[PDB]
Structure 1
Amino acid sequence: GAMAPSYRVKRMDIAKNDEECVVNAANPRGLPGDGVCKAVYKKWPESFKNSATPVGTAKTVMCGTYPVIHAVGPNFSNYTESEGDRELAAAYREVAKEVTRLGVNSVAIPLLSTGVYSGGKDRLTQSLNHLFTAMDSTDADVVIYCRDKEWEKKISEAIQMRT
């Protein structure tokens, strides 16, 4: 575990993380993907061997000895708000179990279902609160990776407001 388990947020490419493992905001088919998706694939392509896993689950594949945790958040384009919310909470619970099983002291994580899978809605608070529900009981240092300065500010404020 980390000596003083913390949350931090960084506004940068998760492919350049400084943590002991990475959560890929995965598709269920283990497909390399397109756009910002390809970043994780480009950095750790070996981790996409047999990475396919259902919505609401997480599957870890090693790239060398570096764990890539494929976490499949729901695509809110396909799910009702209610069922998408359930699967989003479940995907993070499976991430907490994987991070624990791996025995890492740190994990880089994105806000699942807030990008291409957001169904065009702002899910910062929804996704972050499910992340906290799952990871609060883990002792890894959690570093949340985002794209936009405003999201960095809002994630930072939500973290600091509990400390």
Structure 2
Amino acid sequence: GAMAPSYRVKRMDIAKNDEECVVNAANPRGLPGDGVCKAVYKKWPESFKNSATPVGTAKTVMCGTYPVIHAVGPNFSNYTESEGDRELAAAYREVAKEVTRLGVNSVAIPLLSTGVYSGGKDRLTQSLNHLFTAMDSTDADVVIYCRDKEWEKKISEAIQMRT
């Protein structure tokens, strides 16, 4: 574990992370996709061998010795708010199991189901709170990666609020 497990946020490409493993915001079919998923495909294409996994699950595939955790959040275009919320919470619980199993001291994570899978709604708070519920019992250093300065400030404020 980390000596003093922490949460941090950075506004940059998760493909340039400084952590011991990465969470991909994957599609269920293991396809290159767009956004975080395409950057992850360009950086770690070997990790997409047999990466397909259902919604609400995470599947780890090694790129060399570097673990890529493919986490499949729901597409809120297709799910009800209620069922989507359940699957989004589940995806993060499976990420916490994988991070623990791998024995890493740090993980780079995106906010699942907040972009092309958001169904056109702001899900910063919803996605971040499910991330916290899952990861709070892990002792890895968590570094959250986002695209926009607005969200960088809101994620930073949410982390600082808990102290």
Please report the TM-score for the alignment, with normalisation by the length of structure 1. 0.99
Q: Distance in 2 between matches of 1:75 and 1:35?
A: 14
| Post-superposition offset of 1:33 | 1.4
Aligned CA-pair RMSD: 0.6
Match of 1:86 in 2: 86
Secondary structure at the aligned position of 2:132 is classed as helix
| Post-superposition offset of 1:79 | 0.2
**Displacement over 3 Å in runs of 4+:** none
> Quick check: 1:7 aligned with 2:7?
yes
8 Å Cα contact 2:24-2:36 kept in structure 1: no
Secondary structure at the aligned position of 2:107 is classed as strand
Q: Distance in 1 between matches of 2:34 and 2:78?
A: 19
| Post-superposition offset of 1:35 | 4.5
Q: Cα 1:67–1:118, aligned 2, differ >3 Å: closer, same or farther?
A: same
Q: Distance in 2 between matches of 1:96 and 1:36?
A: 19
| Post-superposition offset of 1:38 | 1.1
| Post-superposition offset of 1:97 | 0.1
Match of 2:59 in 1: 59
Secondary structure at the aligned position of 2:39 is classed as helix
Secondary structure at the aligned position of 1:2 is classed as coil
Q: Cα 1:36–1:67, aligned 2, differ >3 Å: closer, same or farther?
A: closer
| Post-superposition offset of 1:4 | 0.2
Q: Distance in 2 between matches of 1:35 and 1:123?
A: 16
Identity %: 100
| Post-superposition offset of 1:37 | 2.7
1:119-142 Cα deviation digits (max 9, x unpaired)? 000000000000000000000000
Secondary structure at the aligned position of 1:19 is classed as coil
Q: Distance in 2 between matches of 1:158 and 1:35?
A: 24
Please report the TM-score for the alignment, with normalisation by the length of structure 2. 0.99
Match of 2:142 in 1: 142
| Post-superposition offset of 1:32 | 1.0
Secondary structure at the aligned position of 1:122 is classed as coil
Match of 1:17 in 2: 17
Q: Distance in 2 between matches of 1:37 and 1:50?
A: 15
Structure 2, gaps ≥5 residues long: none
1:82-109 Cα deviation digits (max 9, x unpaired)? 0000000000000000000000000000
Q: Distance in 1 between matches of 2:98 and 2:144?
A: 17
Q: Cα 1:53–1:15, aligned 2, differ >3 Å: closer, same or farther?
A: same
1:50-105 Cα deviation digits (max 9, x unpaired)? 00000000000000000000000000000000000000000000000000000000
